[PDB]
Amino acid sequence: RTLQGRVVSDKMEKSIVVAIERFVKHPIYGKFIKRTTKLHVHDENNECGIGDVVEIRECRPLSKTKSWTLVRVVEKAVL
Amino acid sequence: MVTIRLARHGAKKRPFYQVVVADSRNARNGRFIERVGFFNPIASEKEEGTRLDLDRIAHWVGQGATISDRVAALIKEV
Amino acid sequence: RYLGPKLKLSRREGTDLFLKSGVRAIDTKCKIEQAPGQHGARKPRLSDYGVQLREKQKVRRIYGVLERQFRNYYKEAARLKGNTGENLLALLEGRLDNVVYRMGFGATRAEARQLVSHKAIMVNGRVVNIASYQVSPNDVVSIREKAKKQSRVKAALELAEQREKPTWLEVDAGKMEGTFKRKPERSDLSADINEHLIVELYSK
Amino acid sequence: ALEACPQKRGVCTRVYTTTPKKPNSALRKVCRVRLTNGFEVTSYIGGEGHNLQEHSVILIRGGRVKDLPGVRYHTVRGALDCSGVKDRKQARSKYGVKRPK
RNA sequence: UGAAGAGUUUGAUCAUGGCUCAGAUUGAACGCUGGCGGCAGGCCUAACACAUGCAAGUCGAACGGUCCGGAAGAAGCUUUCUUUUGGACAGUGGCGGACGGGUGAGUAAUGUCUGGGAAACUGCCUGAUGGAGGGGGAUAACUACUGGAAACGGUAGCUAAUACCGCAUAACGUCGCAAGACCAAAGAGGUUUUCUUGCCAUCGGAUGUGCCCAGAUGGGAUUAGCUAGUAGGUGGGGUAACGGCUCACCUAGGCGACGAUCCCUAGCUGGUCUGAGAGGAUGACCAGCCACACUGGAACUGAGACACGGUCCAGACUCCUACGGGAGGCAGCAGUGGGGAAUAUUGCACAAUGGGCGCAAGCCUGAUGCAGCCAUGCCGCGUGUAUGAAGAAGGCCUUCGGGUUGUAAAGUACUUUCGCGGGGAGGAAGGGAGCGACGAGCUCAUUGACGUUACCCGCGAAGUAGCACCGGCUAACUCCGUGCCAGCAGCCGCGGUAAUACGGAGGGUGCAAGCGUUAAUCGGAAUUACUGGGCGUAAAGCGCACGCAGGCGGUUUGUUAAGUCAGAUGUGAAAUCCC
């Protein structure tokens, strides 16, 4: 699965957290609601930095919290 | 073990068995895999006593599906 | 059904309903003309709701049916197209037990209802033991071959001879059979009922 | 009724008499009952005469007495120690009174 | 094709607002009233305590004895005794008990519901490939002896297997490097040189599962900051397998108003009922899943139970006891007692269907198939049905003229109950035997209800009946008695000499054992209103400014297109809702 998000942190090594956001309708009201999720993607080449909106795909669970890996960087920077 | 027996729709004054191929574990009148025909002991409802549909069962036969003693008789009658 | 004194309902309704010996001068309505009870002599004071109520009453009493189905058939007849009043009698007149009565197989609807339940009546070959059965046109209603011997029907059909039948029907005393030509209109039926008063009541 | 049960037993604490409200005046028979529910409420005693003592133990039905503010329950005569009314020709279905031969 | 509420706050009116009434359902009942017949159904209160019986065995084509039965011998007869053989019990050996059946306490959690993913497994069964050479060892039964009241136990001696172990062949498989080395396996039975049953290793199929993931899953914040393996990394340990799951070291984070944590409640779901729909309530019968069997905890053996008739430990109870010491626990079936308003035969039986084991014969199977008790409910008949005199009696009502009940209120016949006699169903045929290789197939016979009900035929007597209510809502009237007196009442009220609402009587309505009554669930309420609403005076705008998050936001172009929309496909748990 390909997910789009932002790099809200690049503190850890080879591990970058991507804040993916989506828009879904309320099961009752129906009005759109904003919901995000943090995913620890792998980045061995430490290429992606904070503010980078990259793509995320499902890969072999590098760890318990990391089951995704960096694919391609959409833009350059948007802190 | 996938077996091919009869599914009794049995009702007060209404005996009808459904020769179906299902797992041996499942109940006699539980969820079946696929029906191959029917059986009417009295053959009163319709003139067509049974409809084995050879080609159908001919598939399960060899796939690992075993037929009971009673059903085998009806099946053999084709 | 009500199951009880029918010779009292006639007077109560003011009109002489045909329950049984309505022909003989024995019918209480012929001897004394007034509702049952002690207050049958006193001058009654009916109101609007009164005329409508007592109206459908005699209507349902004639066919001798429950208030439930009688109300159900009303909703149906009122649903389909055409004048409700007309359709009303149509459905009620379509009842198997009722048809049998019109055919002459039974002395009355009460006895007819019994004949039906006793499987002593067939419809288009197959037997029907449900009085609430809706008889459609072109359907033949004859007596059971095994019931062709019972003295009761043997005397009923015997009197049926020379007796005329409704335009919406046609029986054959010989074969003891019968046919339901079509649905009877209000013109054919000569009942002491005001289809316009029975409808207003259910309006409320 | 607490458990929302149709009926509930209870041991009477005292079988005293009470007087109706403003619009009435009499000696209505009542009795405090300690239902198994854990509550001690007062119930009215229907009939022209009863035989309830201190250790009566009678089943409670549930009915408010417009005359006695508080009595929201009625006693079921014909059950337990509560002997049904005697010579009750009319209300036998209530008060519990077998039809005389 | 789908939508009509009413009563009560005023002296009167409108508005607001709460309560209340008839509806459907519930593994019930009490109060008083009983005939019958089909079908269906039965402790919803103490997981309270339990007498008694039952709830898994089956194999001699595994092996020695005993019990039961048959046949043939040594004998003139008897005693005694020998051989062969059938069944089975005791023992030894094999398989099974984690399937089925019961209950719902506990449980908010991927436990469940819905769709996916993979770091997996799967006895028996099915398809395909290959193989089964030689050898060695052990413990019971049995025999002898001893201890104990018993349970049961100690010692000595003999002995076999599809019981255990060592070596080869390698179809293969495993491991390092990279493109090398290592590691398997028991027969038996016969129509015995031909098959049958079974085994060893590998791949696949079938089927059943372990684990992970997105979304969804009640009430309260008068429950808010919480957390130390607690969050992440490396290595290791551990498991069938991922994972701090566990350990060492390092880093120091992780989670929270999209409300964690804590507390309360409840098996869940599909569904059930209700409603126009939405939605609400519920989830009892049946089907799936989960959890639990004296209370609590834990582990082993195994494909699978952490396992009711398996085991270990802690605690209480009951029973047995020469008190030394043992035997159990029906929230399994029936049943008992207690409790309660209250819910049944400690009955009959296996042929059918289905299930376990066996090649088969055959055995086991209160799973189940039926009957009994109770109208608890529904269907064709509670107090009757049909017939019947211009109607002389009795009960009922009455303006006292009359009218009504009109088998007569008598009888008679009945739908035709009940009861008696006969026949006796399956809405299912085999097991066995004959033909055929006791295989397929064909043929035939026995056995009927469940160790006799239903239904059919015949005979046949009319063969009980009561309660509630009658002011209004509630359908159904006056006289008499009493007299704010006694009493009635859900609400509005009624009764002080004419009371239809008090007690009685005549009459009438309802029920037609149901109807009333009591209790419980849903909507009407557009009174939280998303569809359906309001805030000057009726309940209701923050005192103001400003400002964070959030919501909303002018115009033009391009890329992406995540949301959104469309086609196809997979699943759409099953069941149901809807038709």
For C11-64, the DSSP string reads: HHHSS---SSTTSSTTSHHHH--S-SSSTTSS-----HHHHHHHHHHHHHHHHT
Q: To which H or E segment does residue C78 belong?
A: helix C67-79
Phi, psi of D42 (to 5 degrees): -105, 135
Between the alpha carbon of residue C55 and those of residues B70, C49, C89, the distances in Å are 66, 10, 14
Q: Which long-range contacts (CB under 8 A, 24 or more apart) does C193-198 make?
A: C193/C55, C193/C58, C193/C59, C193/C62, C193/C89, C194/C55, C195/C84, C195/C85, C195/C86, C195/C88, C195/C89, C196/C85, C197/C51, C197/C52, C197/C55, C197/C56, C198/C52, C198/C55, C198/C56, C198/C59, C198/C85, C198/C88
Q: Quick one: tokens of C87?
A: 């359709």
Identify the three-state secondary structure at position B10.
coil
- CA dist B67 and B57 (Å) reads 10
- CA dist D64 and B30 (Å) reads 55
Q: Facing residues of B17 across strands? A: B8, B39
How far out from the chain centre does Cα C125 lie? 24
Chain E, protein-covered positions (CB within 7 A): 1, 4, 28-34, 40, 119, 124-127, 205-208, 215-217, 231-234, 242-245, 253-255, 258, 287-288, 340-341, 353-356, 380-382, 384-391, 396-399, 401-406, 415-416, 426-429, 440-442, 466-469, 477, 484, 486-491, 493-495, 503-509, 512, 516, 518-521, 530, 550-552, 560, 562-564, 573-574
Q: Hunting for tokens 């004194």 — which residue is that?
A: C5
Q: Hunting for tokens 């895999």 — which residue is that?
A: B33
Q: Hunting for tokens 């006695």 — which residue is that?
A: D68
Point out the nucleotide closest to D78 (alpha carbon to C1′).
Answer: E31
- CA dist B2 and B66 (Å) reads 7
Q: What angle do CA A36, A38, A43 make, to 5 degrees?
A: 135
Q: Work out whether the CA dihedral C163, C169, C173, C176 comes out positive or negative.
A: negative
- CA dist C124 and C133 (Å) reads 13
Tell me the CA–C1' distance in angstroms for C146 and E63: 76
Q: Are strands A68-73 and A32-42 parallel, antiparallel or unpaired?
A: parallel
- CA dist C27 and C175 (Å) reads 33
Tell me the CA–C1' distance in angstroms for D97 and E66: 74
Point out the nucleotide closest to A31 (alpha carbon to C1′).
Answer: E530
**Contact status, residue C28 vs residue C20, Cβ threshold 8 Å:** no
Burial C157-180 (b: 16+ CB within 10 A, else e): beebeeeebeebbebebeebbbbb
Residue among B25, B20, B9, B32 at smallest CA distance from B75: B20
Q: Quick one: tokens of A17?
A: 């957290």
**Contact status, residue B5 vs residue B35, Cβ threshold 8 Å:** no
Residue type, A73: V
Q: Which long-range contacts (CB under 8 A, 24 or more apart) does D18-27 make?
A: D18/D68, D18/D71, D20/D67, D20/D68, D21/D67, D21/D68, D21/D69, D24/D67, D26/D67
- CA dist C59 and C14 (Å) reads 12
Burial of D12 (0-12, 13-18, 19+ CB in 10 A): buried
**Contact status, residue D85 vs residue D61, Cβ threshold 8 Å:** no
**Contact status, residue D33 vs residue D58, Cβ threshold 8 Å:** yes
Residue among D61, D68, D60 at smallest CA distance from D26: D68
Tell me the H-state helices in chain B.
54-60, 69-77
Q: Quick one: tokens of D15?
A: 């079988």
Tell me the CA–C1' distance in angstroms for D89 and E495: 23
- CA dist B77 and B71 (Å) reads 10
- CA dist C135 and C182 (Å) reads 10
Tell me the CA–C1' distance in angstroms for C45 and E350: 74
Chains that touch C (3 or more CB pairs under 8 A): none
Identify the three-state secondary structure at position C196.
helix
Q: Quick one: tokens of A44?
A: 């061995």
- CA dist A29 and A79 (Å) reads 33
- CA dist B1 and B4 (Å) reads 10
- CA dist A58 and B20 (Å) reads 43
Q: Are strands D28-35 and D40-44 parallel, antiparallel or unpaired?
A: antiparallel
How far out from the chain centre does Cα C26 lie? 21
- CA dist B37 and B75 (Å) reads 9
- CA dist A48 and A15 (Å) reads 10
Point out the nucleotide closest to B12 (alpha carbon to C1′).
Answer: E427
Point out the nucleotide closest to B44 (alpha carbon to C1′).
Answer: E427
Q: Is B12 left (phi over 0), alpha (psi -120 to 50) or beta?
A: beta
Point out the nucleotide closest to A4 (alpha carbon to C1′).
Answer: E562
Tell me the CA–C1' distance in angstroms for B48 and E183: 62
- CA dist C107 and C170 (Å) reads 17
Q: Facing residues of C180 across strands? A: C169
Between the alpha carbon of residue A34 and those of residues A7, A23, A26, A52, the distances in Å are 18, 5, 10, 20
Q: Hunting for tokens 């053999």 — which residue is that?
A: B76
Q: Facing residues of C143 across strands? A: C121
Instruction: Give the determination technique.
Output: cryo-EM
